């Protein structure tokens, strides 16, 4: 077959985005081999929601969305259909009809940054619960009480984005894990990205 697309670019990427600013790379009109991601057994945690990993070779879809973000080690349970937590209601939410898979692995040596990584941010405060597959990039000041603050970091008026404290010598805990969410959506349109023939 011809025109083999680089589907493994999202797993071997050199730069990852934050959780509140998660990127979505559209992949279309190519052939993907799913045995590289599941049969190689090189990832730490991986689980498909609704589909079987051995049946993606004969059952194929029209479009795939590749979501990539870096979360903590205990926070991998929040990336699931129907969950609540610190990033499930604020940064990234999966719906109950989620038919994709979640592939994750431990990025200990590369994304370590001894001394405190001050690049990746995440949301603790928000005025409402986040919709599934919705991204929030704008950064205003949260107001949990009746107090107008115009650029004031005083009482009850703070920044709504913190830093991921990452330590290289720690029992696993909040370890940075690179999570790639491959959404598998099947529509009534003619299919574009299918498996090997």
């Amino acid at each position: 077959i011809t025109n083999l697309c680089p589907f493994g670019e999202v797993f071997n990427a050199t730069r990852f985005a934050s959780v509140y600013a998660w990127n979505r790379k559209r992949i279309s009109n190519c052939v993907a081999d799913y045995s590289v991601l599941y049969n190689s057994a090189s990832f730490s945690t991986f689980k498909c929601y609704g589909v079987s990993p051995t049946k993606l070779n004969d059952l194929c879809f029209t479009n795939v969305y590749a979501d990539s973000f870096v979360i903590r080690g205990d926070e991998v349970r929040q990336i699931a259909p129907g969950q609540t937590g610190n990033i499930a209601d604020y940064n990234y939410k999966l719906p109950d009809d989620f038919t994709g898979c979640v592939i994750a692995w431990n990025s200990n040596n590369l994304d370590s940054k001894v001394g405190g990584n001050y690049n990746y941010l995440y949301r603790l405060f928000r005025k409402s619960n986040l919709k599934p597959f919705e991204r929030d990039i704008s950064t205003e000041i949260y107001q949990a009480g009746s107090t107008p603050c115009n650029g004031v970091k005083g009482f009850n008026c703070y920044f709504p984005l913190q830093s991921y404290g990452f330590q290289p010598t720690y029992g696993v805990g909040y370890q940075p894990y690179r999570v790639v969410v491959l959404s598998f959506e099947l529509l009534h349109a003619p299919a574009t990205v299918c498996g090997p023939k």
Partner: antibody, heavy 117, light 114 residues
Framework: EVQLQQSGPELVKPGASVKISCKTSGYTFTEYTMYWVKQSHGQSLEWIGGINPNIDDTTYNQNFKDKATLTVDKSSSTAYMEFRSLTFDDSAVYYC??????????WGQGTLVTVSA | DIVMSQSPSSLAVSDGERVTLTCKSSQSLLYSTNQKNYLAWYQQKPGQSPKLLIYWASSRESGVPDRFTGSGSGTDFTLTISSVKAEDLAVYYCQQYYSYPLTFGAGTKLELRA
């Protein structure tokens, strides 16, 4: 509605300390914010300070610097206010103010603290 | 800090008359983003705890009777009661929510006649 159970009356001496509690019930204690209002001179209302229990932040008034401290208890859902270096002017009625919503702020019963020798 | 004044300090009212209470601030309490005036009106019964009646200077809280109407914006604020009753014998206060520290009013107590 919101149940704000305060302590009873205290009879203390100047120079000692006192503790004022305010137990909440019915709503989430870690969601809203806590405020304290001191009613002195019969009718005048004075603002002591506030302390959002979620991330434990605390602010105070200029009239109440280095006198009152605010701590919370997450396991019992009770707020604390402890006064140090009491004077004769501190003999007043202290109230527990809970900021549930901007439409109505819920008040307790009142803590009468009479300090004399 | 932000200070406020009440005018007057006491008013003699009879049953059936309308009463207006004036709360004037030293500066404007208008927030341009929310387009609301951060000011609250309280009422303290003798022997009871004070309760909030009018929030954001133009809205009536649920459970307050319809005689309590709030008005005003910016600096001049007015609490208007259409017809008082026997249960209206209390003291009223004025509190702003614009900035810290929170400032309470002087207190307006109603009387009888004559």
């Amino acid at each position: 509605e919101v149940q704000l159970q305060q302590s009873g009356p205290e009879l203390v001496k100047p120079g000692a300390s006192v503790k004022i509690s305010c137990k909440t019930s019915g709503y989430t204690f870690t969601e809203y914010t806590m405020y304290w209002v001191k009613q002195s001179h019969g009718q005048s209302l004075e603002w002591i300070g506030g302390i959002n229990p979620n991330i434990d932040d605390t602010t105070y008034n200029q009239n109440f610097k280095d006198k009152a401290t605010l701590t919370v208890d997450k396991s019992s859902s009770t707020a604390y206010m402890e006064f140090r270096s009491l004077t004769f002017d501190d003999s007043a009625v202290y109230y527990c103010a809970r900021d549930d919503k901007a439409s109505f702020a819920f008040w307790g019963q009142g803590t009468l603290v009479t300090v004399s020798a | 800090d932000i200070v406020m004044s009440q005018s007057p300090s006491s008013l003699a009212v009879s049953d059936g008359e309308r009463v207006t209470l004036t709360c004037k601030s030293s500066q404007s309490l208008l927030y341009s983003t929310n387009q609301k005036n951060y000011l609250a009106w309280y009422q303290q019964k003798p022997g009871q705890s004070p309760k909030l009646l009018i929030y954001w200077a133009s809205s009536r809280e649920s459970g307050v009777p319809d005689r309590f109407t709030g008005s005003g914006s910016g600096t001049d604020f007015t609490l208007t009661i259409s017809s008082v009753k026997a249960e209206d014998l209390a003291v009223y206060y004025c509190q702003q929510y614009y900035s810290y520290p929170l400032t309470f009013g002087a207190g307006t107590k109603l009387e009888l006649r004559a």
